[PDB]
Design a protein around this ligand. Sequence first.
Ligand SMILES: Nc1ncnc2c1ncn2[C@@H]1O[C@H](COP(=O)(O)OP(=O)(O)OP(=O)(O)O)[C@@H](O)[C@H]1O
Ligand SMILES: Nc1ncnc2c1ncn2[C@@H]1O[C@H](COP(=O)(O)OP(=O)(O)OP(=O)(O)O)[C@@H](O)[C@H]1O
Ligand SMILES: Nc1ncnc2c1ncn2[C@@H]1O[C@H](COP(=O)(O)OP(=O)(O)OP(=O)(O)O)[C@@H](O)[C@H]1O
Ligand SMILES: *[C@@H]1O[C@H](CO)[C@@H](O)[C@H](O)[C@H]1NC(C)=O
Ligand SMILES: *[C@@H]1O[C@H](CO)[C@@H](O)[C@H](O)[C@H]1NC(C)=O
Ligand SMILES: *[C@@H]1O[C@H](CO)[C@@H](O)[C@H](O)[C@H]1NC(C)=O
Ligand SMILES: *[C@@H]1O[C@H](CO)[C@@H](O)[C@H](O)[C@H]1NC(C)=O
Ligand SMILES: *[C@@H]1O[C@H](CO)[C@@H](O)[C@H](O)[C@H]1NC(C)=O
Ligand SMILES: *[C@@H]1O[C@H](CO)[C@@H](O)[C@H](O)[C@H]1NC(C)=O
Ligand SMILES: *[C@@H]1O[C@H](CO)[C@@H](O)[C@H](O)[C@H]1NC(C)=O
Ligand SMILES: *[C@@H]1O[C@H](CO)[C@@H](O)[C@H](O)[C@H]1NC(C)=O
Ligand SMILES: *[C@@H]1O[C@H](CO)[C@@H](O)[C@H](O)[C@H]1NC(C)=O
Ligand SMILES: [Ca+2]
Ligand SMILES: [Mg+2]
Ligand SMILES: [Mg+2]
Ligand SMILES: [Mg+2]
Lengths: 330, 330, 330
Amino acid sequence: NKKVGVIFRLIQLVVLVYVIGWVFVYEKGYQTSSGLISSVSVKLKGLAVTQLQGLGPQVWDVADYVFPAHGDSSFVVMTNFIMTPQQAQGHCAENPEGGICQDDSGCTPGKAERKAQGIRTGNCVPFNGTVKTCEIFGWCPVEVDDKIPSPALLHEAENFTLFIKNSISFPRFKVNRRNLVEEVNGTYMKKCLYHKILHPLCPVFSLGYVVRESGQDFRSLAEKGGVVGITIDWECDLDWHVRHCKPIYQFHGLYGEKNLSPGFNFRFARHFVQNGTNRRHLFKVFGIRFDILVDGKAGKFDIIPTMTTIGSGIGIFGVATVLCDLLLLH
Amino acid sequence: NKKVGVIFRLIQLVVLVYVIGWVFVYEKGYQTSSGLISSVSVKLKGLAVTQLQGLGPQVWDVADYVFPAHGDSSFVVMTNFIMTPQQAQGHCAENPEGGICQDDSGCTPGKAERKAQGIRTGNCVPFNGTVKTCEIFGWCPVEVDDKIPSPALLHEAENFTLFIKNSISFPRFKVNRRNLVEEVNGTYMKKCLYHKILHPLCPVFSLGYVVRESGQDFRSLAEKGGVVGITIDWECDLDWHVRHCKPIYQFHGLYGEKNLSPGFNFRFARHFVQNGTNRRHLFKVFGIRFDILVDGKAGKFDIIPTMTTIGSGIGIFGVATVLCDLLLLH
Amino acid sequence: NKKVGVIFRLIQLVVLVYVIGWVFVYEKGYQTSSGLISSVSVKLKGLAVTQLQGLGPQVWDVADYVFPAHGDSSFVVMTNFIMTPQQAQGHCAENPEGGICQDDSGCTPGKAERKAQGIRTGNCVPFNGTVKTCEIFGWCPVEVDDKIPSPALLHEAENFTLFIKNSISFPRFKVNRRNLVEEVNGTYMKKCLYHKILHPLCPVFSLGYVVRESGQDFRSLAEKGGVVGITIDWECDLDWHVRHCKPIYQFHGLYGEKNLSPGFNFRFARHFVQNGTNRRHLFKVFGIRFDILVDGKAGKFDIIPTMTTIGSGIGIFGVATVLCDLLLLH
Ligand SMILES: Nc1ncnc2c1ncn2[C@@H]1O[C@H](COP(=O)(O)OP(=O)(O)OP(=O)(O)O)[C@@H](O)[C@H]1O
Ligand SMILES: Nc1ncnc2c1ncn2[C@@H]1O[C@H](COP(=O)(O)OP(=O)(O)OP(=O)(O)O)[C@@H](O)[C@H]1O
Ligand SMILES: Nc1ncnc2c1ncn2[C@@H]1O[C@H](COP(=O)(O)OP(=O)(O)OP(=O)(O)O)[C@@H](O)[C@H]1O
Ligand SMILES: *[C@@H]1O[C@H](CO)[C@@H](O)[C@H](O)[C@H]1NC(C)=O
Ligand SMILES: *[C@@H]1O[C@H](CO)[C@@H](O)[C@H](O)[C@H]1NC(C)=O
Ligand SMILES: *[C@@H]1O[C@H](CO)[C@@H](O)[C@H](O)[C@H]1NC(C)=O
Ligand SMILES: *[C@@H]1O[C@H](CO)[C@@H](O)[C@H](O)[C@H]1NC(C)=O
Ligand SMILES: *[C@@H]1O[C@H](CO)[C@@H](O)[C@H](O)[C@H]1NC(C)=O
Ligand SMILES: *[C@@H]1O[C@H](CO)[C@@H](O)[C@H](O)[C@H]1NC(C)=O
Ligand SMILES: *[C@@H]1O[C@H](CO)[C@@H](O)[C@H](O)[C@H]1NC(C)=O
Ligand SMILES: *[C@@H]1O[C@H](CO)[C@@H](O)[C@H](O)[C@H]1NC(C)=O
Ligand SMILES: *[C@@H]1O[C@H](CO)[C@@H](O)[C@H](O)[C@H]1NC(C)=O
Ligand SMILES: [Ca+2]
Ligand SMILES: [Mg+2]
Ligand SMILES: [Mg+2]
Ligand SMILES: [Mg+2]
């Protein structure tokens, strides 16, 4: 019965290497894990000029296309918009999307149950020469978004510069880290663009590069909106120096079927007073949605997790020996 | 004895079924699990007309009551508000809740330590015919919010239509899903409203229906504000087809004591220039805020989790056999 | 030997006391834990007057320095700003930090690849008496933010009052709780300031106190920006009365190296129409970023977790007895 003893010793050494190698080195059992508190700050530096027929050139800056101007992890960068200027409340025709009337008797006074555009007065007024729509009480210039410009108005926003400022701190270990690692210098930040292989630590991200890394064409998203997911990973080992701690950036493309509700869009208004009359400008903005999520874990050596892992390894070794003895007994 | 062997085989088959079933089949240990990256897009439709005393009708559209116009998981829908128009900086009387003075000597120049309304000039001026308040420097049309209208101004927002666009993707499995499931055909959305049993996949949610599902009456919340929590679950099995992956919507009502701090409210201003003077309109908006949280888990068959579960089951079987033998030995 | 036997009995009773005490009493294994749904509401009460050279006093109320006026867990409180008023689109000189030209031939028509400030017409115009900059198309009053005032403009915002309204609910146990505990009352809320020892339940947080508890001086964070992280813990036991459930507030300071990108800052603009011409006021706001994160769990007695913990304890006791017997055999 020497071969059975050799098999027993082989199982013994295998489970020993498993409990000493996988639990300690691979899983970092002797270390302890703690969460972090993260705050994301984003700033854009880009300018795009859009010229519309019958209107002067429009200058767009960081305050314009960044609607969360205060700064948030979730922000929208405007790429295409539909402008309905000089809106004023009054009795006027509605959009043909709500309904088409051939006579005043067909119109019913009240409010539409679904997709209401205003309060119908019960009269049928011609929206244009061909068709007629119900008269409603509201903003007289209706947003007609049936025509979307195929070339993106803010097409210059493809190669803009996006700077992400992320500060993370572990309360258990009392260590504060920032995306600006020691390998990040001022002269380096002056001229650098983020790359997956060349410049990973450069905190300046190109919007077109971010969109292309996610797997989406920038033009199709700029046409009618899009969603891009950015994730920052702070997995690091505090047994080494804090210089080794560096963030990892991953880009994920969030998209759906193109036939049903493609892209991301919303409507906002700028209220102003002109000539003593309250007016507003309505914009249907097709912009790319950027969501930043920060998840990180830090491991530092501690005696209690080490002792617990040693006890678990001893228990696993004992269970393995007992199972081998039972298999030998048959 | 025979009973000893019967009990032994019974425990054997019980632990075998346990390690091959609940542990393996029910808990789905043969599949790996990972998180998702989610982005929430919300769009509101519906119009409400509010006619104030001594003021013309005010038309409110999606851009108006939705203050997060860009689109976020946490958004506030206006249901009631208190409007103080034409606010200009100057020297004027303060609110009575801040302080009541009977003479100029009682007033003290400076700023209030708590609940400051303006820089006190140091003179006692009559707020109205009966009482007098300290003169302060700031917006002279001071907000008087002691009277809240019992009927909600934007009470038509009960049966509005809320569209939620959620795109989730699992980076581990590289599978992208959207709330617009294959059952959603685009024409179904034209005439569907979300229901717990009838229309679970309709992406259009009625605000009143959501408030009722949360366990609250819409009128009481619309009067003085409210908080409603919406959760979306994406638990699915990747071994089946992707069509089986469907989101589950749950509504939670977040409330508290009605006596102390009832509802939810905030204050914002719209700055404009009229007649060469900087003026603003102050609104105390009593509206219901909706917080959308997305959590999902996907499982797909993998060999390593299966092997680990098989090893754990074999270990548990061995431990159970040892314990049964020790118990039968007595 | 009897001594070996009593040693084995001592070891087994020790491990039994361990598995019965640590798992049940200390770790609360007999009860199950679930997550919560949290919504954070913040309200600021404070007024700061900033007087600029050549401009009248400016009143900044809650609606002014709270840019997320609708209310969110992540909000920025304005403490210092650089104001550039009366911005209009035109052909004027650019900022000298972008480029300096000595002749018209040096200028290149087009847009800058990095940090673009506008569309260069191609002519070199004098920015001031000494130096000349490239003429660009855009907002003529180019922002000159080289000089930052050392005293914070909104330095009065140090001892302002911040009220946090957090409502949490556990869907598994259907228990709803709010940060306003039964001990907190209206008279207490009228006059109280949060303290770690004196007033832990007071929901009114002083901004200066919050910044000092995080470990940062308020002056530098007000001058050049800062980030402060607030965490709310709702760890509670449902075996006791709901009165014992009270939130715990912790403040974490998120900072980085001062040499490279110190503090937090953003840029926003207010659009208005004056004299029939579209104009805007651009502000470079240096403010403290406040992030509120809520994480908590609740535990209530259940039979299935208790039975599972009892089974695990019996298994651990059996494994320990088997290992002790194997050691005694050696
Ligand atoms: N989106 C961006 N693209 C390119 N560079 C950026 C961007 N954001 C910041 N930077 C650079 O990082 C440096 C430090 O950033 P910081 O947060 O101090 O901005 P800032 O200096 O206040 O902005 P500005 O350069 O407009 O004054 C700046 O010199 C700036 O040039
Ligand atoms: N809140 C809502 N209530 C009801 N239907 C909605 C809502 N939001 C969107 N829809 C419908 O869903 C469809 C697809 O949504 P999508 O994001 O394409 O809107 P859209 O067509 O860009 O906006 P609009 O309908 O204003 O032109 C639209 O035809 C629209 O009618
Ligand atoms: N930032 C704050 N600082 C000090 N006290 C506050 C603050 N926010 C709210 N409170 C106090 O809490 C009480 C209840 O809060 P609530 O949300 O009802 O405010 P409110 O009464 O709507 O606002 P206001 O007091 O301005 O009318 C109020 O009486 C108010 O005095
Ligand atoms: C009038 O408006 C309708 C709206 O759908 C459009 O189909 C039609 O072509 C328009 N006619 C003219 C002459 O513009
Ligand atoms: C791409 O980047 C360059 C900068 O080198 C810029 O000039 C160009 O306009 C960008 N492309 C688009 C489509 O904006
Ligand atoms: C700063 O770090 C960057 C990293 O690539 C490096 O290229 C640059 O030379 C460094 N500058 C100094 C002054 O060390
Ligand atoms: C004057 O204002 C005070 C404020 O509380 C109010 O109680 C009182 O009724 C007012 N008097 C008149 C005549 O409006
Ligand atoms: C309920 O919905 C209907 C649409 O069918 C609408 O007409 C009605 O105004 C809604 N109720 C309220 C109180 O808004
Ligand atoms: C699309 O799916 C919906 C799901 O309810 C169904 O009612 C509708 O008939 C379907 N349309 C088509 C054209 O299949
Ligand atoms: C002109 O502007 C430049 C910008 O850097 C500055 O250095 C210089 O001192 C200015 N000269 C005068 C006279 O203001
Ligand atoms: C500190 O708080 C007091 C209120 O007691 C206030 O008067 C003072 O202005 C505050 N300090 C600063 C620097 O704002
Ligand atoms: C309000 O709460 C405080 C905090 O302990 C307490 O001292 C005070 O007695 C309470 N007042 C009332 C009326 O309950
Ligand atoms: Ca205006
Ligand atoms: Mg449309
Ligand atoms: Mg009040
Ligand atoms: Mg600068």
